[PDB]
């Protein structure tokens, strides 16, 4: 299958109660492998997956120096944005950047990312082209010229096409036991009687990786989105994920309903019906 | 590896 590396960056201003809180995490697929917290004691990039602890001290000195420059950079960014939008130093604000890699099943480069958000809305993003920007506001339009003048794309493209791709493959080789695995969902289902006259049918899926999964409820082999409940896919905490879909049904008509599961680890989609 | 020159807005 295909794979991805993404670094996510979050800086939030807390004016008058300290300097901005900055958090930088790194993922490969749905497995996190690095952390940095500006408020944390260590002031170093820390391993959060066992396969990356392999990396020498030069890796951590370097990645810590880079992530510190990001903390420093985003601190300025909140200040710059406040100025761009003519807003007051009183209010709290949040800054968000994402960049990363995609590779296909052939481990050849697929696409590159560099996206940015101010308090939850798209600010600026680099296009699929890796050579040009999409500015939302006039604010982002000024950021756009600043980056075109500097020639940001030049090596940012080289990083996402090159170094980012090169190192994602090295991570997939080193952590192949955790990254390249495919844990198929452990499906069951439960029946709770809300009363006489009604009943709930919950469709389980547990201990699966990666997180991508589909649960759908059919009434007599026909899709029903009416009176369903879909919970957000949730992490178990041990590198696996859980998801369930429920439907409230008339009592007696239990075996009229079927739950459709789709996962990459499942050779073809399992269907579930009440015993 | 991270990108080392995160550009300032």
């Amino acid at each position: 299958g295909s794979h991805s590396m993404r670094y996510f960056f979050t800086s939030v201003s807390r004016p008058g109660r300290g300097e901005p809180r900055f958090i930088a995490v790194g993922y490969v697929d749905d497995t996190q492998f690095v952390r940095f917290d500006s408020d944390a004691a260590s002031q170093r990039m820390e391993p959060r997956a066992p396969w990356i602890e392999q990396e020498g001290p030069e890796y951590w000195d370097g990645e810590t120096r880079k992530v510190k420059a990001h903390s420093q950079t985003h601190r300025v960014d909140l200040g710059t944005l406040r100025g761009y939008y003519n807003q007051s130093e009183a209010g709290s604000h949040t800054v968000q950047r994402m960049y990363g890699c995609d590779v296909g099943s052939d481990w050849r480069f697929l696409r590159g990312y560099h996206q940015y958000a101010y308090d939850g809305k798209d600010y600026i993003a680099l296009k699929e082209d890796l050579r040009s920007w999409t500015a939302a506001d006039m604010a982002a339009q000024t950021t756009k010229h600043k980056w075109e003048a500097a020639h940001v794309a030049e090596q940012l493209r080289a990083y996402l096409e090159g170094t980012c791709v090169e190192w994602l493959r090295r991570y997939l080789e080193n952590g192949k036991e955790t990254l390249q695995r495919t844990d198929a969902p452990k499906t069951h289902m439960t029946h709770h009687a809300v009363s006489d006259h009604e009943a709930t049918l919950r469709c389980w899926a547990l201990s699966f990786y990666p997180a991508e999964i589909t649960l759908t409820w059919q009434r007599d082999g026909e899709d029903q989105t009416q009176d369903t409940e879909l919970v957000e896919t949730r992490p178990a905490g041990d590198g696996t994920f859980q998801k369930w879909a429920a439907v409230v049904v008339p009592s007696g008509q239990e075996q009229r309903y079927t739950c459709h599961v789709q996962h990459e680890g499942l050779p073809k989609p399992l269907t579930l019906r009440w015993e | 590896r991270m990108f080392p020159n995160a550009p300032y807005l």
């Epitope: 000195d61 420059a69 420093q72 601190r75 500097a150 940001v152 | 590896r1 080392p4 020159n5």
Partner: T-cell receptor, first 112, second 113 residues
Framework: DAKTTQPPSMDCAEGRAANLPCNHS???????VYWYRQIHSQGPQYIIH???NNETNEMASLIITEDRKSSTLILPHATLRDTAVYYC?????????????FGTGTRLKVLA | GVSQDPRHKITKRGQNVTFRCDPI?????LYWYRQTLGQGPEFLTY????????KSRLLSDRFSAERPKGSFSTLEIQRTEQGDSAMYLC????????????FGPGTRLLVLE
């Protein structure tokens, strides 16, 4: 770790092209390479960058090999003022290091 | 427009000295380097805004570099030894893109007994 190599000395005839070579022996391909010039008791003066494709400006031109393991700074019609020490440096930025390692550089002496 | 003062400096062995650098404004990164006769510049320190993120493992302890307002930078040498004699170059860079490092005109420090 990110070092370059250039010949110590080189003579060029005034008005003809000066072709100063540099080997990016250990420089990562996705890192910028830079060129600087310097004369006695003065701060180094910047010339030109390099990444993938060749570059050119009023000061000079730099032509990058396919492998990007070697570059050539080119001063087209070398004036007497182009006599100086030339430094080819490469980024180590891909690791967490923002230093640059200068070697001895090539002392170009253009002959009138 | 990278500025440095003083352009020259003679100090007695054992005395303390300080150099200033006023970098190009809009430049997030500031570097110190030093240069002895007929050698290439040698890295000392790197600033990203106010933050000193990289010291030169070799040259420090008696040396102290600050950049309090993430603009101008000072470098202080307490109890100078003759071996501190060199040209001390300041440099600044935008901090992203071709991030080209522009040198200053240098402080030529000579320490005598």
């Amino acid at each position: 770790d990110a070092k370059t190599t250039q010949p110590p000395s080189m003579d060029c005839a005034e008005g003809r092209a000066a072709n100063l070579p540099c080997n990016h022996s250990t420089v990562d391909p996705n890192e910028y390479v830079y060129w600087y010039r310097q004369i006695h008791s003065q701060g180094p003066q910047y010339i030109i960058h390099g990444l993938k494709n060749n570059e050119t400006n009023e000061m000079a031109s730099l032509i990058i090999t396919e492998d990007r393991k070697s570059s050539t700074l080119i001063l087209p019609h070398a004036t007497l003022r182009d006599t100086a020490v030339y430094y080819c440096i490469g980024g180590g930025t891909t690791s967490g290091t923002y230093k640059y390692i200068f070697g001895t550089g090539t002392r170009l002496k253009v002959l009138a | 427009g990278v500025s440095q003062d003083p352009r020259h400096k003679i100090t007695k062995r054992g005395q303390n000295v300080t150099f200033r650098c006023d970098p190009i404004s809009e430049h997030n990164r500031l570097y110190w380097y030093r240069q002895t006769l007929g050698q290439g510049p040698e890295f000392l320190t790197y600033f990203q805004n106010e933050a000193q993120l990289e010291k030169s493992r070799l040259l420090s302890d008696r040396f102290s570099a600050e950049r309090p307002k993430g603009s101008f930078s000072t470098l202080e040498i307490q109890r100078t030894e003759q071996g501190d004699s060199a040209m001390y170059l300041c440099a600044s860079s935008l901090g992203f893109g071709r991030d080209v490092m522009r040198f200053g005109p240098g402080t030529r420090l000579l320490v005598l007994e």
